[PDB]
């Protein structure tokens, strides 16, 4: 029961789990009555969800993953924990390969966990191995890492992943586990269908929502002093501990380097000390600006997309300019409030920005269509931007807008965004943008 999981967790990996979801996922795999989908971030709790259950299963767990870099890093650690793991890749000498194929044909092989590429898992040079494993009831779990590579609406589509659906079907008796860090509901639809996962598919999706972050849009068009507004936002967010004076630090995001340089100046003039970070600076300059921010010499950094970090006391992230994508806005904005203390996330929206960026997306989508040809991904790129304009231009819980797009349940807002806090002033400010249209 739960009894065994605790001990095997402790005995081997030397652990309680990083979260109670990570827990619930792992337990479900173990019951092995169901396929399961795990969308968790790069915290790497996901790995345990298939690794631990593999040991308790008294058979072999195959683990499909797209590239060696990804595989190698784990197998090294898995060994170090004295666990019988094996990578099968064509970067391997014929002898090492053939050693392993031999091992797999043994009643009771050494290998517990086999890390394969989709290439090999597809190759007919491996199907007989696979057949014999199946027939000898030796396959405990099929695992597919980077599951999202099966989706053309995903950022990283791989035709090889299409063969994996056929594979799951052959390996019927075994539970299948799919993992990715990044899936829109459309990508989850593709994953469940393409990999022929079996209902009820149990899902363990890390929620986007963070209580301690306060989300609001401002319209640069409806604003006398934009620069002044920003400084007041920065002021409120810094000095949440006035006995210290200025507590915390903050990021301002811009599309262009000149915007950064200029906005750094305007802020510094108004009495909020900000230095610009962009690829335009010598590398030396960048390492120094990063330092000052990181060691609180300078409370505010003004940066382009090129921001290298993991500070805990980020009291605010302001987007001066709309981001290329909902996901990039989530990623970038979420650099705030890692310490768990209150933080402020603000988007400054301009229809001229929307237009300026909408074009640059399409222009850099065109540069790819010339380089390689058309992709359903190119539609998703534009869809990724459309979702953020909708975030700005509609009335609704800002947190819930994000959770809808990613595929989370309705979040526990608690007057944690502009619209949840005063629905009517948001109505006012939208109405206002319609008049100025």
């Amino acid at each position, epitope marked *: 029961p739960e009894r065994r999981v605790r001990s095997t967790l402790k005995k081997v990996f030397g652990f309680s789990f990083k979260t109670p979801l990570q827990e619930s996922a792992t337990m479900a795999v173990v019951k092995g009555n169901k396929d399961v989908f795990v969308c968790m971030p790069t915290g790497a709790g996901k790995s345990l969800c298939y690794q631990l259950p593999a040991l308790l299963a008294k058979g072999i767990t195959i683990v499909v993953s797209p590239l060696i870099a990804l595989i190698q890093d784990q197998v090294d650690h898995l060994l170090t924990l004295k666990v019988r793991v094996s990578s099968l890749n064509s970067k391997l000498s014929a002898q090492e390969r053939k050693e392993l194929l031999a091992d797999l044909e043994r009643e009771k092989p050494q290998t517990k966990i086999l890390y394969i590429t989709p290439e090999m898992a597809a190759s007919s040079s491996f199907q007989p191995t696979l057949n014999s494993l199946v027939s000898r009831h030796l396959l405990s779990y099929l695992v597919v890492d980077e599951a999202h590579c099966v989706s053309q609406w995903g950022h990283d589509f791989r035709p090889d992943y299409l063969r994996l659906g056929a594979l799951r079907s052959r390996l019927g008796h075994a539970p299948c586990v799919a993992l990715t860090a990044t899936a829109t509901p459309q990508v989850q639809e593709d994953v469940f269908a393409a990999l022929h996962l079996k209902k*009820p598919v149990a899902i363990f*999706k890390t*929620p986007c929502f963070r209580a301690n972050l306060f989300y609001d849009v401002q319209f640069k068009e409806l604003i006398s002093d934009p620069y002044g507004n920003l400084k007041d936002f920065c002021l409120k967010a810094l000095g949440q501990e006035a006995d210290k004076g200025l507590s915390g630090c903050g990021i301002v995001y811009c599309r262009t380097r000149e915007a950064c340089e200029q906005l750094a100046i305007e802020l510094s003039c108004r009495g909020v000390n900000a230095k610009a970070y962009h690829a335009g600076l010598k590398a030396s300059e960048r390492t120094l600006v990063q330092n000052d921010w990181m060691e609180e010499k300078v409370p505010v950094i003004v940066a382009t997309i090129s921001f290298g970090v993991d500070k805990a006391n980020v009291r605010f992230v302001a987007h001066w300019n709309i981001a290329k994508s909902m996901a990039g806005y989530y990623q970038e904005s979420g650099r705030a409030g890692r310490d768990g203390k209150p933080s402020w996330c603000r988007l400054y929206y301009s229809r001229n920005d929307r237009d300026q960026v909408s074009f640059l997306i399409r222009k850099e989508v065109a540069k790819l269509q010339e380089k390689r040809g058309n992709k359903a991904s190119d539609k998703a790129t534009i869809m990724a931007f459309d979702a953020l304009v909708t975030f700005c231009e509609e009335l609704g819980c800002r947190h819930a807008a994000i959770a809808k797009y990613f595929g989370d349940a309705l979040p526990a807002c608690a007057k944690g965004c502009d619209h949840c806090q005063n629905p009517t002033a948001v109505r006012r400010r939208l109405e206002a943008l319609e008049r100025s249209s």
Partner: nanobody
């Protein structure tokens, strides 16, 4: 798990009208396809009409024009407006929640198909 429960059925006269309401319970995020089936006594289950998430609708020929399927997106509920009824239409009507994505704010979810309880529909 999830509940599909149908409402709005009864006995009505030929050339009359009903509007069926299919209610889906549980933490539903989305439903790929909701479809209306009717089971006439002594006949095979008949496919009536259906609506995709994003509102694409299609109808059996036997009911085109007479019937219309609709989504109160707000409500998370589908409706089959049946006008110009006939004794033929007499049957039990149920729903199929195909590709039903269910999610809690814990992160703990499912994806599965669900079948409705049914509601009686009699036409004199």
């Amino acid at each position: 798990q999830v509940q599909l429960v149908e409402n709005g059925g009864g006995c009505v006269q030929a050339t009359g009208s009903l509007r069926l309401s299919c209610a889906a319970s549980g933490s539903i995020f989305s439903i790929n396809r909701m479809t209306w089936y009717r089971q006439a006594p002594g006949k095979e289950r008949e496919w009536v009409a259906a609506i995709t998430s994003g509102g694409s609708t299609n109808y059996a020929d036997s009911v085109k024009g007479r019937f219309t399927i609709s989504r109160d997106s707000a409500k998370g509920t589908v409706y089959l407006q049946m006008n110009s009824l006939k004794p033929e239409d007499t049957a039990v009507y149920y729903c199929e929640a195909y590709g039903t994505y269910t999610l809690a704010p814990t992160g703990e979810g499912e994806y599965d198909d669900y079948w409705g309880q049914g509601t009686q529909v009699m036409v004199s």
